[PDB]
Design a protein around this ligand. Structure first.
Ligand SMILES: C[C@@H](c1ccc2ncccc2c1)c1nnc2ccc(-c3cnn(C)c3)nn12
Length: 289
């Protein structure tokens, strides 16, 4: 049972903005539409009816850890961009951890979308999806918000095929455990194959290490969702990157686009482009298609 007296009254006042009454929300616990480490995602509907995705946090059973997760993710309510996933609200209730309510994404996550063989997205489709991610990440960087887990699996597609940068703030979790590894300095599960080299070394995350991840994500798009470095063990990813080695050019990636990737992986964080700069580069490349 989550007691709001246990919640920092500081937290109560930010949460209050977005709370959803339990009678305003219907959840179908028999309809799992996603699986994370903190809980499952269910089909819900929010009241004037709205189809939505209900993220459970019930795996987080400690009130203090629940309170810290809310504290860190609540700023989410303050963001608004067509390429960034929005928060519909938070449903506190009678027993168990809070439910987080997000818009329903009709086409699921981006990686599964492009791996689907009937979809068979063209090079131009894929580059366009990449442009959309660049714009959402441009917005988040302007807010000084570091994502720390950008990857194709962590972006969603709505009914209009608009890409939403997702898996951040209150929607943060690990939604595919295969790509998180404890073989890093922290000892905790991390997406080591999407991480900038200095992140693996110093354990720090910046907008510049997001740029690095965006490069890997571009690579994923052009390979239609192939796993990065299938041949590099999680034990070797750091030294591999130290030796100057990088993901290879995808068969159907335009030479100009590969150049952008290499840039995102420059060893000197300050030498890598900004997202504002990436939106320009990639737009011009898309336009020449
Ligand atoms: C709140 C949850 C969510 C949101 C909307 C959904 N709409 C429809 C269906 C499921 C949904 C799940 C969410 N928020 N950010 C993210 C980022 C990635 C993923 C994910 C799930 N599986 N895989 C392979 C990736 N989920 N995710």
């Amino acid at each position: 049972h989550i007691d709001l007296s246990a919640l920092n009254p500081e937290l109560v006042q930010a949460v209050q903005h977005v709370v959803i009454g339990p009678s305003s929300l219907i959840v179908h616990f028999n309809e799992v539409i996603g699986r994370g480490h903190f809980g499952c995602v269910y089909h819900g509907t929010l009241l004037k009816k709205i189809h939505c995705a209900v993220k459970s946090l019930n795996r987080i059973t400690d009130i203090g850890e629940v309170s810290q997760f809310l504290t860190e993710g609540i700023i989410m309510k303050d963001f608004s961009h067509p390429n960034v996933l929005s928060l519909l609200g938070i449903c506190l209730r009678s027993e168990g951890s809070p439910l987080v309510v997000l818009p329903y994404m009709k086409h699921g996550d981006l990686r599964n979308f492009i791996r689907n063989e009937t979809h068979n997205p063209t090079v131009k489709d894929l580059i366009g999806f990449g442009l959309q991610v660049a714009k959402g990440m441009k917005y988040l960087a302007s807010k000084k918000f570091v994502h720390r887990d950008l990857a194709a699996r962590n972006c969603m597609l709505d009914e209009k095929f608009t890409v939403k940068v997702a898996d951040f703030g209150l929607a943060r979790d690990m939604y595919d455990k295969e790509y998180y590894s404890v073989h890093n300095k922290t000892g905790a599960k991390l997406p080591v194959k999407w991480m900038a080299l200095e992140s693996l070394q110093t354990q720090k995350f910046t907008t510049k290490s997001d740029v690095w991840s965006f490069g890997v994500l571009l690579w994923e798009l052009m390979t239609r969702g192939a796993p990065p470095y299938p041949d590099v063990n999680t034990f070797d990813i750091t030294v591999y990157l130290l030796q100057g080695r990088r993901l290879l050019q995808p068969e159907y990636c335009p030479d100009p686009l590969y150049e952008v990737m290499l840039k995102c992986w420059h060893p000197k964080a300050e030498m890598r482009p900004s997202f504002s700069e990436l939106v320009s580069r990639i737009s011009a490349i898309f336009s020449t298609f």
